[PDB]
Amino acid sequence: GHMGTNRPLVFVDLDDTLFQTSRKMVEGTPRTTATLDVHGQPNGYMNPIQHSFISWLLASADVVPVTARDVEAYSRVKLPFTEGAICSHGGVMLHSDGSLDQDWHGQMAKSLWAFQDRLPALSEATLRIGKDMGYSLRGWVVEEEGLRHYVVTKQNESDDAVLSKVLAEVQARGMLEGMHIHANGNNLAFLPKGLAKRLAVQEWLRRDAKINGDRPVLGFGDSITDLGFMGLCHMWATPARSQLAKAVEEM
């Protein structure tokens, strides 16, 4: 029979799915502010199709962000999400009022305590090995209060090919055993085994099923690594010029 709401549950990636930075848009084209930088100034935007799409989607379905952003960076997203969120590559679940889900935090803590020393050392070694290559890098450990989640590294050369080289060497030096990687644009991330958008979306669906039974689930994402959580949905979707769509084009 029917229980709860019939409307779709839609898991949406954020950066380069709902909005993007200025450098990824054609100059002068109209835009709406979607994110702020740490100094409080606009730094991410929606074009006219994008703001029309997310407005319709938020009005029509239960929309849940599934993002690499940590909680602070997610709080700089200026979109009226009302159902909570998955943050930090699946390391964090937020309730609808923005408060931290204590149960998931306990489970993630358990999965991640074997990595708490390795993560700062891995970021340090990557940033050193990057300067050894002569590359001007930038990186840090993404973390919540008390718990370190994953390592991120960016380049300042305006050449994303730099990061593919480091990934090749770090892999050969055997630094990534027990971990998986995300690479898209100027972003290279090293994630512990038990940290994944897929795991948090899997838990979100388990909880939803007790309230709403089986209802249509849709996943939207732009990265190849977003296929993890997107594969848990009944239908998945991607922007026409995404990293994922471009890879499908070449297949």
Which residues are near a second copy by CB under 8 A?
A: 6-8, 48-49, 52-53, 55-56, 60-61, 214-216, 218, 220, 227, 231, 233-240, 244-245, 247-249, 251
How far apart are CB 156 and Ni ion at their closest, in Å?
Answer: 21
Structure tokens that stand for 88 in this block: 């930090």
Structure tokens that stand for 205 in this block: 């669906």
* Closest of 76, 43, 78, 39 to residue 58, by C-alpha: 78
How far apart are CB 165 and a second copy at their closest, in Å?
Answer: 23
Structure tokens that stand for 146 in this block: 């008390």
How far apart are CB 188 and a second copy at their closest, in Å?
Answer: 20
Closer CB to a second copy, 66 or 119, in the complex: 66
Which residues contact residue 95 at a Cβ distance below 8 angstroms, ignoring those fewer than 6 apart?
84, 101
Give yes or no for residue 16 binding Ni ion (CB under 5 A): yes
The number of CA neighbours under 13 Å toward the Cβ of 242 is 22
How far apart are CB 12 and a second copy at their closest, in Å?
Answer: 11
Closer CB to a second copy, 33 or 55, in the complex: 55
Closer CB to a second copy, 176 or 237, in the complex: 237
DSSP state of 4: S
DSSP state of 8: P
- The binding site for Ni ion (CB under 5 A) comprises 13, 15-16, 222
